[PDB]
Amino acid sequence: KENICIVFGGKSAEHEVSILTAQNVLNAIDKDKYHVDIIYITNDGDWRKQNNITAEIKSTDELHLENGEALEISQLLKESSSGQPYDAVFPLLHGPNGEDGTIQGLFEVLDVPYVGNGVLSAASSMDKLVMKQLFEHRGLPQLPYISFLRSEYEKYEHNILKLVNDKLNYPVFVKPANLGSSVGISKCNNEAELKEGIKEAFQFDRKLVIEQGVNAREIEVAVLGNDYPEATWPGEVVKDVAFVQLQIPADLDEDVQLTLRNMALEAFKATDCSGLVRADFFVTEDNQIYINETNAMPGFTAFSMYPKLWENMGLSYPELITKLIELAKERHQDKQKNKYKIDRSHH
Amino acid sequence: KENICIVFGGKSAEHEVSILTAQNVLNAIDKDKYHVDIIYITNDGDWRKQNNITAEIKSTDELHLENGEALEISQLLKESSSGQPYDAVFPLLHGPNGEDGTIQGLFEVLDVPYVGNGVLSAASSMDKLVMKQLFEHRGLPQLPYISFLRSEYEKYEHNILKLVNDKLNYPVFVKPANLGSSVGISKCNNEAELKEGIKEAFQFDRKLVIEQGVNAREIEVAVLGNDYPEATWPGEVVKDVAFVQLQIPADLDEDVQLTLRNMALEAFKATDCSGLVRADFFVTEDNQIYINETNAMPGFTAFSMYPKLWENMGLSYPELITKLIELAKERHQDKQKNKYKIDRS
Numbered sequence: 001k002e003n004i005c006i007v008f009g010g011k012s013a014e015h016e017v018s019i020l021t022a023q024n025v026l027n028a029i030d031k032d033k034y035h036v037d038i039i040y041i042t043n044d045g046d047w048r049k050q051n052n053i054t055a056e057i058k059s060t061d062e063l064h065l066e067n068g069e070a071l072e073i074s075q076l077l078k079e080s081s082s083g084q085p086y087d088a089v090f091p092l093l094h095g096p097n098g099e100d101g102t103i104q105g106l107f108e109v110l111d112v113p114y115v116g117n118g119v120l121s122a123a124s125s126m127d128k129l130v131m132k133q134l135f136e137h138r139g140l141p142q143l144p145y146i147s148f149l150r151s152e153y154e155k156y157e158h159n160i161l162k163l164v165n166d167k168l169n170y171p172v173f174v175k176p177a178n179l180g181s182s183v184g185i186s187k188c189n190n191e192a193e194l195k196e197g198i199k200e201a202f203q204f205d206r207k208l209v210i211e212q213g214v215n216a217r218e219i220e221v222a223v224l225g226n227d228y229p230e231a232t233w234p235g236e237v238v239k240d241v242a243f244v245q246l247q248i249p250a251d252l253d254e255d256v257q258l259t260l261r262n263m264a265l266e267a268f269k270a271t272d273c274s275g276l277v278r279a280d281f282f283v284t285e286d287n288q289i290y291i292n293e294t295n296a297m298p299g300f301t302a303f304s305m306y307p308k309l310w311e312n313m314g315l316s317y318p319e320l321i322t323k324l325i326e327l328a329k330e331r332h333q334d335k336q337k338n339k340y341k342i343d344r345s346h347h
Numbered sequence: 348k349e350n351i352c353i354v355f356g357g358k359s360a361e362h363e364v365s366i367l368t369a370q371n372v373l374n375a376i377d378k379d380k381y382h383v384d385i386i387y388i389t390n391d392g393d394w395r396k397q398n399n400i401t402a403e404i405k406s407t408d409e410l411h412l413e414n415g416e417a418l419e420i421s422q423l424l425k426e427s428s429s430g431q432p433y434d435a436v437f438p439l440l441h442g443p444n445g446e447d448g449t450i451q452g453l454f455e456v457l458d459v460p461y462v463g464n465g466v467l468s469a470a471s472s473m474d475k476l477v478m479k480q481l482f483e484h485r486g487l488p489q490l491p492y493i494s495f496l497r498s499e500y501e502k503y504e505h506n507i508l509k510l511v512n513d514k515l516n517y518p519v520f521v522k523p524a525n526l527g528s529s530v531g532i533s534k535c536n537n538e539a540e541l542k543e544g545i546k547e548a549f550q551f552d553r554k555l556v557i558e559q560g561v562n563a564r565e566i567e568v569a570v571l572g573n574d575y576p577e578a579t580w581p582g583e584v585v586k587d588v589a590f591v592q593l594q595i596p597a598d599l600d601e602d603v604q605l606t607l608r609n610m611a612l613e614a615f616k617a618t619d620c621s622g623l624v625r626a627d628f629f630v631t632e633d634n635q636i637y638i639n640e641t642n643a644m645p646g647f648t649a650f651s652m653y654p655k656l657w658e659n660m661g662l663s664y665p666e667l668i669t670k671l672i673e674l675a676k677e678r679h680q681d682k683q684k685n686k687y688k689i690d691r692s
């Protein structure tokens with residue numbers, strides 16, 4: 001019997017979704033295959049552990065832990081309640097700066113096996129500019145965009161504003177590079193809104209992307225695995241006004257669906273993901289495809305897109321959770337075996 | 348006094364360079380201006396703190412190392428033995444196990460102010476493929492290269508080999524993408540050899556780079572800063588043949604030097620560095636410049652290239668160390684301002 005830890009909470013204003021997701025994951029986990037503990041990180045960095053979750057979590061209130069296994073973070077992560085290391089830890093949260101890739105590094109430093117994306121991949125996917133450069137190199141289609149540092153804008157503003165006029169069609173979005181789904185973002189219908197836009201965004205971030213807007217469907221593909229990933233049929237986030245209602249499979253023609261699946265695997269590769277990614281695309285009325293972004297930590301409730309895309313392939317939510325644990329072990333085992341191969345060559 | 352920590356040692360095979368480097372850095376810190384603790388990571392992964400280094404370390408043996416205080420990972424990592432929070436922590440080591448970027452993540456999680464590159468820049472510069480894609484986007488010149496995952500070579504070996512034949516001149520080098528300077532690098536003069544080198548590299552990595560080799564001088568530029576970084580004149584290891592004395596400034600045309608300085612600033616930005624990078628170029632006999640890589644954790648003894656390059660600009664080694672501390676504070680304060688502003692919608 002394997003030992004699992006769910007870490008959730010966070011100081012970031014995603015506390016509640018993190019908690020709901022922990023409840024969803026906790027309730028889809030079979031407790032006779034898995035010995036499960038939880039760690040709740042407050043909006044304070046107080047780490048609170050509860051051991052041996054053996055029963056359905058009837059309420060999200062239950063999971064606002066008031067108490068933890070008093071021990072230090074290190075100790076809380078390096079041994080399961082069963083006395084052995086964890087087989088897999090689920091980081092169901094962003095870095096308590098809203099960051100990704102930070103908790104992964106903690107885990108890596110403590111030699112804790114963990115679910116999902118590694119450090120480079122989780123950090124890569126949270127930086128829109130790095131993400132777009134990786135997709136471009138991979139040959140994935142993207143909408144026109146421009147990027148620059150604050151230092152660049154302050155020196156070459158006229159040049160940069162020219163570049164937007166020459167390359168992008170209004171309306172455009174000004175977006176901070178290094179947030180997730182947050183402030184700083186403004187749709188701009190003209191140059192004067194652009195400049196307001198840049199200034200507001202520079203208040204939260206020193207690096208920006210300006211992207212061309214489009215009228216398109218939001219189409220998403222779930223990818224699962226490590227070295228030989230698989231992509232779901234696409235699903236659609238149905239909305240009458242772009243500014244969860246899911247349609248799975250998406251109403252797209254078959255060649256488009258296939259192209260999307262393949263580009264999802266490509267996106268997953270381009271950012272060197274592990275465990276999973278959700279690839280999010282724009283698909284126009286005329287079936288022009290652009291990749292919008294990958295999401296290394298997608299909504300993961302039982303009713304969320306990523307899990308429901310798998311259900312449609314016949315991978316149920318409990319099985320998806322098990323598959324991600326297995327992937328997590330494989331990846332950890334593989335990294336350690338390679339450490340051994342290298343050490344040995346050194347010797 | 349401000350409060351500094353140096354973390355050093357680590358599982359990795361850099362263990363003893365890391366120890367020497369702590370020693371150098373320690374002896375370059377003015378103890379009337381700075382209170383200083385150190386944390387040694389043991390080969391087995393254990394953290395051991397030695398508080399309040401107050402004298403010159405004449406010999407590695409005056410460092411407790413494995414025999415410092417047992418240290419769990421916690422919020423306390425923020426805290427000096429003075430009872431003040433650390434102003435800056437030097438991570439003088441690579442990821443004890445994994446990539447680089449890992450102890451940075453840990454510091455990020457624990458809100459520890461740290462010197463040097465952040466998660467994404469430390470990680471992306473330990474990944475040659477990601478580093479090369481970022482260079483390319485910035486318009487930096489690089490030697491022709493191809494890359495692939497194991498899974499792809501397994502499926503498409505013949506096409507991949509043809510690609511090298513088509514796109515690259517031999518000799519070529521086969522490089523694991525991940526970890527630095529280490530195992531699984533081959534020089535390959537023909538296809539028979541390449542296929543051997545690929546096979547051998549995949550024992551240690553799941554992702555490879557194949558580069559066209561060149562005959563070039565290796566030339567380096569140190570950069571220092573956060574948002575308004577500055578680049579040193581370039582330097583070179585003195586060597587009559589290209590297949591430890593340094594020449595700083597390097598023996599190059601002024602204009603080639605200026606171009607390298609600018610390119611270094613560009614490489615710093617391309618990988619979104621903080622604090623510092625050393626940008627390492629190949630310069631051919633006919634002055635063709637190729638960025639080879641950036642190094643987020645460059646040699647940092649008193650005599651290492653990175654500190655010597657700054658010494659030539661008139662920035663002494665202790666001033667270098669102080670500047671890195673100040674940058675680390677500025678950066679940390681800036682993230683604190685941003686998170687505050689972000690969180691306030």
Ligand SMILES: CC(C)(CCl)C(=O)Nc1ccc(C(F)(F)F)cc1
Nearest residue numbers: 018092093094115116297298299300
């Ligand atoms: C929607 C979130 C609560 C945002 Cl972090 C979330 O954490 N999702 C998420 C976290 C972790 C993982 C996984 F653990 F599988 F890698 C998948 C999805």
Ligand SMILES: CC(C)(CCl)C(=O)Nc1ccc(C(F)(F)F)cc1
Nearest residue numbers: 365439440441462463644645646647
């Ligand atoms: C030379 C090493 C021992 C290799 Cl990991 C090393 O750690 N160098 C180094 C580490 C840290 C820093 C900095 F503190 F600036 F980040 C600069 C240089």
